[PDB]
Specification:
metalloproteinase, hydrolase, ATP-dependent zinc metalloprotease FtsH (chains A, C, E), elongated, Methane Monooxygenase Hydroxylase, Chain G, domain 1, binds mercury (II) ion, homohexamer, two-stranded antiparallel ribbon
Chain lengths: ~180, ~180, ~180, ~180, ~180, ~180
């Protein structure tokens, strides 16, 4: 794996962690390296937020052209999750507290268009928030990336250490 | 595993169902509220939807739109299926009429599916609004139910009604 | 089975019988209780008429809210029958003397929309006639229901007896 | 089991097919009218539709739209299939053109299916009207055929033509 | 096989051969009777041309009503071929250098409408050219047909012989 | 079996791919031109399309729209699949967004498929135009490459670049 590619991965893996550590609710632990119940609407919004942080950080650091294939799963995981909010758990105002029956069964194309719209809406939103977040914290993120590329693997605590050195206090979610 | 946050959510969802059941002018059910060939008419099945929706309805009144939970999955699916049968199996919608979809739907037009979907959406929207209104209207005594629920982990309909009679509401029969 | 439910069933089973006994053509025999060739367009219209009589009587006696699940088969049987008239036996002017090929095969959505329209038209019609019929004969029907609820099972002849006592003479179709 | 009503219907349906066959300026067939690798051109298959439709055509002229029967099921299906091939297999429609649907149709646009359905509908409508017109125009001698049909239960084309020559119509050859 | 049918077949089989022998490119050999790499856009256009020659000749000689079932394969073979040009080999300007994925998979109805349009366009065109060709050479074609019906089987050379006797010089493609 | 006509076509198609590869400011590949878990970014895959399209691009510049060949089948299919993934698997289109089609697509709206198809069409159209422009701009030295190709049947990237340096173009590295 060439240094150019390592830089990408680094920015990407930092992005997730950033989202997790800021995420207003999203309960979840951490770790970070260059190698790899009942939820409410808020919880799932924040889960999407985390899932898009990789790609979000990619776009902040490299523009729309430095966007990577490495977010293939994250986009699928996030889109699935938004799709359940809309078609399974009535979490869309437009769509309403309806569930899609069965892989939908005998659903009008109009219902699908509505859903696809709302999935897009939800995802566009969480992704715009993630970019904003990466932006706001670009400088201390750069610092984290440097250490990442150097030591190859960071702990959750060091990530926080670096951010405290910048006056940003991240949520207590590490172990 | 269950955090006081999640446990509260459950309580409210559960108190929501029972509220709907006890006020439901038709629907009848075996109430026991915890944290751990026939013939139905249009009135009946509407009241079934009402009940099925109470949980989510309670979530929204109490926690706003963001507090809406995954816990209602089974509930929303049953409601939707039920309304779906009302429209496509029984002739229970005026727009669609006493027509029965050749059920998987087989060789039904996209136009018809759309009409059906709209009518399913109408039934549910209506009952959902009803459920919320009732929870709203009975927010006060319901809190009291929830407080005891969280405290003792399991309540009987009797206690539930006991709190309600205290507030001056005469809930219907239906327990054991 | 509770008395409220027995009343429903009674009205329902009376409705069919009424339709059969008045039905301008529909050849078919009878019996009535609280427990359970080559046809022309007229014949099949009347068969639909009979199939909808249950629900028709339900709506006359209890309004649109007292409508029951008990007509699940009747609606399917009737709708199937109208659907064959339209898609199998060219009995629709709008659609014309065309047959749908195979569970249709490779048929335009427009053709399906047309068919669905015509099926709806046919069924709406026969159902409006059945309601009208129940209406016109509500009083002697009430009488039949009473005896039904009392004796639990009526013969075709008694049904007629009751109607003759009202000056309505029903078609000779019983044995 | 067969009532005089039903038996009459059958007779008329059967007399309808044969009429079309005997007048059909192209189509050729083995006439025997009872109660109990090749190459066809556009003209030929049109005449096949004509024949296939004669039964129903006869029903409608004689009994109005309400007298239309189930007996034509097989007939309408064959006609429709035939016209369907004309349009989607052979290049026999001007609107659709010498295009052949990749036959189940595979990955054909909804637009194309609609065009095809319209053209199938045109062929059939046209021939149906033709069939009716002919039955109308020959109502009188056809009754006479039907009377003998009902009387003797089975007629030969010969007798059928015999009645027609008597009325002054010279039907074509095609029997045995 | 009746003489009327033999005349049809004759005209049909002559039509192909005509197309082959004139076809500006289409490499292909011949023979003719009353019984039965890497190509460019031009090559495939001409292959369609050959495939439609049968039907084309049928319509020239008998009008739109003398059109036969005998061209069932030719229309399928040609339509398949145009369909590959459009959906497989980016040979349509309207559609562009795109390939349809899999029996298409997950393709919009709009894309299919576009394709169906372009397939129709290509085929309409080649078929109008084939008719024109049959027209232009109707007289010497009649001559060929006569010999065909007489001797039942013609060689490629005789076909040419007849055309040379008319001052038309056909491409050197026989053996 | 291969006619001088067909052999020329092949040469040009092959010279087209290599041209694109050698000029491609990103894409890297194992050049050897004859007649016989990772991470890619948007820039990278665009350059892959460019390469995949070079063959056809070369065909069109040299032989016009009628000279377009069957030889590009595999090429067009790969390009299309790649762009299809860009749009529907990776969030690489602005119109569609960081949305991922639940892949066979499952229960996606006709509207979405249309958006996707349009965007796939945009990527490819753009890169196709790029490929052609480059072939156009380097028509002269490419002929020279083709002449040697037809002459010796197999060329190395080295020779290819050798001709290009002679014309005054400094192509990038990427060979062995
Ligand atoms: Hg990731
Ligand atoms: Hg629940
Ligand atoms: Hg019934
Ligand atoms: Hg028949
Ligand atoms: Hg042929
Ligand atoms: Hg290639």
């Amino acid at each position: 794996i060439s240094p150019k590619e390592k830089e990408k991965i680094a920015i990407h893996e930092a992005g997730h962690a950033l989202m997790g550590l800021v995420s207003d609710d999203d309960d979840k632990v951490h770790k970070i390296s260059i190698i790899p119940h009942i939820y409410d609407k808020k919880d799932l919004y924040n889960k999407i937020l985390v899932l898009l942080g990789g790609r979000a950080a990619e776009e902040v650091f490299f523009g729309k052209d430095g966007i990577t294939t490495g977010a293939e799963n994250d986009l699928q995981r996030a889109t699935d999750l938004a799709y359940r909010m809309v078609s399974m758990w009535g979490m869309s105002d437009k769509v309403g507290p309806i569930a899609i029956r069965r892989t939908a069964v005998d659903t009008s194309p109009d219902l699908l268009r509505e859903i696809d719209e709302e999935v897009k809406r939800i995802i566009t939103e969480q992704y715009e928030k993630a970019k904003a977040i990466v932006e706001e914290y670009k400088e201390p993120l750069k610092a984290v990336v440097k250490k990442l590329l150097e030591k190859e693997t960071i702990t959750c605590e060091e990530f926080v250490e670096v951010f405290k050195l910048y006056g940003i206090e991240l949520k207590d979610k590490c172990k």
